[PDB]
Design a binder for these strands. Structure first.
Lengths: 242, 331, 131, 120, 179
RNA sequence: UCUCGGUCGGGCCUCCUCUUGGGGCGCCUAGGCGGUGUCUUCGGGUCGCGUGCAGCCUCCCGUCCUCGCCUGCCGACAGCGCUCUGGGGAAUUCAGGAGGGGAAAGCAGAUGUGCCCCGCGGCGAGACUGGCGCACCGCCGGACGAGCUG
């Protein structure tokens, strides 16, 4: 396997922020770590001594559907460095740490955890990384942190809830700039167990267009997870930013 | 950028006053051109994108000073026809767009208030004060100035209204509370000078709510006692002084401020054979407070400051003066 | 408080703002060999792993950095190289692995197959014709 | 400068009164903001320093002073104006004396001929 | 003028500042640059010649096909232009019509045809040579860079007597006679 | 000076007035060169083993013998592309285009102040009143009103 201490190189990936570490027999995904030299979850990290302080962190795609989607090769995830990134589903903040490392010390992540102990993990990672603020409350009630979240540009969402479309609809209606960019994770077994998952995907899409989006890309993150679809869309317009 | 055009509006409205001043012998043509030029440059400076309250004050000072010069010169020319209305009105409009662009300047606000008050527009003044209070609800100074203007006019109910809304708001500092007590006792003094208020229980009441205020401190009650001790020539002044004394004795018993008010307590309306007798009484209080188990450094600092005021007042006896000097040196 | 300024008034860019300043690659000949290896990482795995044949003609990325894996605290019994296997360079690592024999074997196969009928063959014919 | 553009319309004077402090950051900054074709014809020799914003050293000044008469006449006339005006000060006078002395040394080094008439 | 906006474009449909319909796609200019002429007056003189030529062709075709004088002048125009090199065949009036062209004239000027014979690398640099004057015709030198080289003279136009160029050639090909 | 007709000119409109038996610059290769790595042939040496015979054995260095690799040059013909006031390069001048931030960026109807009076309108203490009310618990409506204010 990709055992520790191997000499690999890092090159830029076409989305900003993310880099790709390639070496020997292994190619894999990585991001500049803000808080240098300290793991998040016993993740592997990459050192480099530049002519010291700079260190990167690998992601596991099996762990984060965000990673898996990038490896599948989405077009654009809208979260350039500097972009205010709402998260939904701060499942103890692993991928949230990764996305914080993307948006950097100039960006911002506002996170939503509903469970408490996961939230303890979450606020721990927030206490480390300054650019992510946590929010622990019910994502179904964006009134609960309407005082706390300003206008963000990209909504990531990965909650496993059956009302997912109306959830993202209301949170978008309260927190998204015209020209909104969003990604959402679909577990077809969670939305509708009986149905064929592709049609499940379609129904999700049509609910989202009903809630005024425009889908523009969509793929099964297949060789990293079964029956999940990443969907990329825009709020309220066609081209991405403005 | 539309700045030229917006200036075109304001300068074109400025025109006919200048037409009239041309048509009078009050100014000559080159002066007129100087005036128009300066006005245009200032107006452009105001409607610039990046502007600042200092620039605003600069401009309005220019116009107001022009008004005064015009007045002086037409007085020298003994001409009564010209008014100041248009100048004052355009001056107002300057203040209005000033507060639209920068609402957040106490400095520019108070300049506005003072401008209105010097020209005699009290209804407008109350409106302006209203908006300023609405934009800065933590500012004791504006709260005070509004309420003090209301009390000086005499509208005691609206004075109380401003002050109660302000004490409802500004609960970090005691400052408004002392100011409201000050003007309320001043109103009681106005009633006594004109001679319920027969009781005058209201400074007791504000002291009672002060007791549960967030800033509620021993030093707070001490300054309360100070402003109460001002103008003791009253009726229930001894009543309220006894009350504040017994309350802070019950609450902060061995505080050096409690010992300080225990000293300076019987000196309510005194200047005078009643002067040195109460002096000796408070001096017995002082020696008792000094020998008592209190923070002697704090109490002595309080006492040498009060003695600094005491020696600041004149007309006393030398033996008394020197024994105060010795009791201060012994601290 | 208000002091005299300093004057300091006297091409394609150097470090990348849009990727947290990966520097432009200094091109050590070892790094060039490394990149040659990486573009050939297909033939490294002798049939045991096929990669997506990401081949430009210009095998060089204009931005790069040479790094090393730190520590997988989950796996520290085998997922880590021993000191005598912690080599300075990628090509050194692939040297220190096995199947260098197998490389040699395949190379000498192709050596034969291209020495097939080219010139020594013909000289042997003309010799055994001249005799 | 920012009002009357002294550096543009009284160039030679300001360059004159800053030349004595020719080692200092003030002088280099002024050197930056000077307009080139505006520099008086004697002082044109500071242009490579404008191209490279470092102060010139005193040997460079004295060498141009030795070659030309006009720069030396100019410095002397400036400092004479000052001391006619009773506004001189020991730093400037020391500057002027040093530069005049080294310049005259070098000038006699040039004027030596051997040939009787050219020496005369 | 900036790229005009949407509605302003829909008003300035027929407005353009460069390509005039009188400017004729700038055919004048496109050719003149491509063929290195020095006198757009010389372009238009070429042109009205080509025009007289084409109206002769058109009226010639207008003549009924069976006539002697038609046959005689078909042959005459064709073989004459062919000996002026501007054509490529000598048996097709349709080729005279939609083929005879000022561009073909320019490619039978002098510098273009010395590029074709390979005197020099690019017809610009050829113009520079013959302006300095290394380039002879027959036995004369030639300065006028519009000396229209007819086909009987392409075989002759060569280098002049005392030329550093000719001596350079002999230098490279190693026969450099100093006599 | 109200129409009308006709006319080898023009305005307007059209398709030609370019797509060259051409040139430059590239791709592509047969291959020459430089760097350089094997395999064969032997010879010298070398770590060690052995019986220190015989041998065995690691490593190196040189010859022979050919073959191969290099974003390395150059690269004939033929085929293709681009492009032609030839192709590069640097300063510098003007004419546009595309995108990133930074910017309260904010003229929907731009009327001096103060008074009183009138008109109209709001709050607004308080005082009534009509009918309705088969879960019976209260509704909803008229019209007076001190005082304040627009």
């Amino acid at each position: 396997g990709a055992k520790a201490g191997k000499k690999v190189i890092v090159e830029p990936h076409r989305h900003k922020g993310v880099f790709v570490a390639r070496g020997g027999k292994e190619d894999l995904l990585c991001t500049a770590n803000l808080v240098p030299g300290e793991s998040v979850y016993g993740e592997k990290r990459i050192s480099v001594e530049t002519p010291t302080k700079t260190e990167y962190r690998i992601w596991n795609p099996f762990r984060s559907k965000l990673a898996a989607g990038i490896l599948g090769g989405l077009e654009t995830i809208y979260m350039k460095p500097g972009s205010k990134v709402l998260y939904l589903g701060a499942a103890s903040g692993t991928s949230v740490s990764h996305v914080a490392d993307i948006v950097g010390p100039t960006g911002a992540v506002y996170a939503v955890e509903f469970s408490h102990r996961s939230g303890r993990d979450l606020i721990n990672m927030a206490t480390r990384r300054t650019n992510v603020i946590p929010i622990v409350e019910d994502a179904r009630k964006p009134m609960a942190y309407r005082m706390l979240v300003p206008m963000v540009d990209v909504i990531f969402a990965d909650v496993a809830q059956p009302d997912q479309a109306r959830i993202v609809g209301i949170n978008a209606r309260l927190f998204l700039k015209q020209g909104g960019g969003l990604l959402i994770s679909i577990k077809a077994s969670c939305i509708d167990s009986t149905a064929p998952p592709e049609q499940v995907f379609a129904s999700e899409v049509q609910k989202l267009r009903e809630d005024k989006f425009f889908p523009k890309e969509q793929l099964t993150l297949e060789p990293y997870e079964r029956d999940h679809a990443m969907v990329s869309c825009v709020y309220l317009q066609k081209e991405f930013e403005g | 950028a539309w700045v030229a055009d917006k200036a075109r509006f304001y300068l074109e409205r400025a025109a006919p006053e200048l037409r009239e001043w041309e048509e009078k012998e009050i100014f000559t043509k080159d002066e007129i051109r100087n005036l128009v030029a300066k006005r245009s440059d200032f107006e452009h400076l105001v409607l610039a994108p990046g502007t600042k309250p200092t620039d605003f004050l600069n401009y309005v000072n220019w116009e107001r000073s022009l008004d005064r010069l015009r007045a002086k010169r037409c007085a020298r020319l003994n001409i009564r026809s010209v008014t100041s209305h248009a100048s004052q009105a355009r001056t107002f409009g300057i203040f209005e767009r000033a507060v639209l662009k920068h609402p957040g300047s106490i400095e520019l606000w108070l300049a506005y208030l003072e401008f209105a008050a010097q020209v005699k527009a009290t209804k407008r003044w109350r409106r302006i004060m209203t908006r300023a209070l609405r934009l800065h609800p933590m500012n004791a100074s504006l709260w005070t100035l509004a309420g003090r203007r209301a009390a000086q006019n005499g509208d005691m109910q609206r004075a109380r209204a401003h002050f109660l809304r302000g004490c409802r708001f500004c609960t970090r500092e005691p400052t408004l509370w002392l100011e409201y007590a000050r003007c309320e006792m001043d109103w009681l003094a106005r009633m006594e000078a004109k001679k319920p208020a027969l009781s005058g229980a209201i400074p007791i009441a504000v002291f009672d709510v002060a007791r549960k205020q967030p800033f509620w401190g021993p030093a707070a009650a001490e300054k309360f006692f100070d402003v109460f001790a001002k103008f003791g020539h009253l009726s229930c002044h001894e009543r309220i002084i006894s009350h504040v004394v017994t309350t802070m004795q019950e609450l902060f018993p061995n505080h050096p401020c409690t010992w300080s008010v225990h000293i300076r307590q019987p000196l309510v309306g005194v200047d005078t054979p009643a002067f040195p007798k109460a002096l000796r009484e408070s001096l017995a209080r002082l020696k008792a407070a000094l020998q008592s188990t209190t923070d002697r450094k704090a109490l002595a600092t309080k006492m040498v400051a009060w003695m600094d005021g005491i020696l600041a007042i004149e007309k006393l006896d030398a033996a008394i003066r020197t024994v105060l000097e010795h009791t201060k040196r012994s601290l | 408080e208000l002091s005299v300024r300093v004057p300091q008034l006297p091409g394609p860019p150097d470090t990348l703002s849009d990727w947290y300043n990966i520097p432009r690659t200094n091109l050590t000949p070892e790094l060039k060999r490394d990149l040659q290896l990486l573009r050939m990482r297909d033939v490294v795995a002798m049939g045991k792993q096929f990669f997506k044949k990401d081949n430009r003609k210009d095998f060089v990325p204009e931005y790069c950095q040479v790094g090393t894996i730190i520590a997988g605290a989950t796996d520290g019994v085998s997922g880590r190289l021993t000191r005598k296997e912690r080599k300075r360079t990628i090509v050194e690592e692939v040297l220190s692995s096995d199947s260098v024999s197998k490389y040699k074997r395949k190379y000498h196969e192709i050596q034969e197959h291209k020495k097939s009928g080219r010139k020594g063959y013909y000289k042997k014919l003309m010799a055994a014709r001249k005799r | 400068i920012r009002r009357f553009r002294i550096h543009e319309f009284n160039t030679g004077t300001l360059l004159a009164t800053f030349l004595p402090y020719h080692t200092i950051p003030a002088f280099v900054t002024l050197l930056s903001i000077l307009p080139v074709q505006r520099i008086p014809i004697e002082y044109r020799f500071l242009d490579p320093y404008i191209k490279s914003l470092t102060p010139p050293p005193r040997a460079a000044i004295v060498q141009q002073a030795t070659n030309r008469p006009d720069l030396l006449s100019a410095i002397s006339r400036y400092t004479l104006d000052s001391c006619r005006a009773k506004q001189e000060y020991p730093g400037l006078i020391s500057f002027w004396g040093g530069i005049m002395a080294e310049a005259v040394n070098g000038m006699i080094d040039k004027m030596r001929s051997g040939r009787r008439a050219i020496q005369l | 003028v900036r790229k005009l906006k949407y509605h302003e474009q829909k008003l300035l449909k027929k407005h353009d500042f460069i390509n005039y319909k009188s400017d004729n796609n700038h055919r004048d200019h496109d050719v003149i640059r491509r063929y290195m002429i020095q006198k757009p007056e010389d372009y238009h003189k070429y042109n009205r010649l080509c025009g007289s030529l084409r109206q002769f062709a058109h009226r010639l075709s207008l003549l009924p096909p069976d006539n002697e004088v038609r046959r005689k002048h078909e042959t005459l125009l064709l073989d004459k232009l062919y000996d002026m090199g501007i054509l490529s065949t000598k048996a097709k009036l349709s080729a005279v019509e939609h083929n005879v062209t000022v561009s073909a004239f320019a490619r039978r000027r002098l510098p273009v045809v010395m590029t074709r014979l390979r005197m020099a690398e690019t017809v610009q640099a050829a113009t520079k040579l013959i302006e300095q004057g290394h380039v002879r015709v027959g036995v004369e030198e030639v300065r006028d860079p519009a000396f229209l080289v007819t086909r009987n003279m392409e075989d002759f136009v060569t280098w002049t007597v005392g030329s550093k160029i000719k001596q350079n050639i002999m230098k490279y090909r190693d026969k450099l006679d100093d006599f």
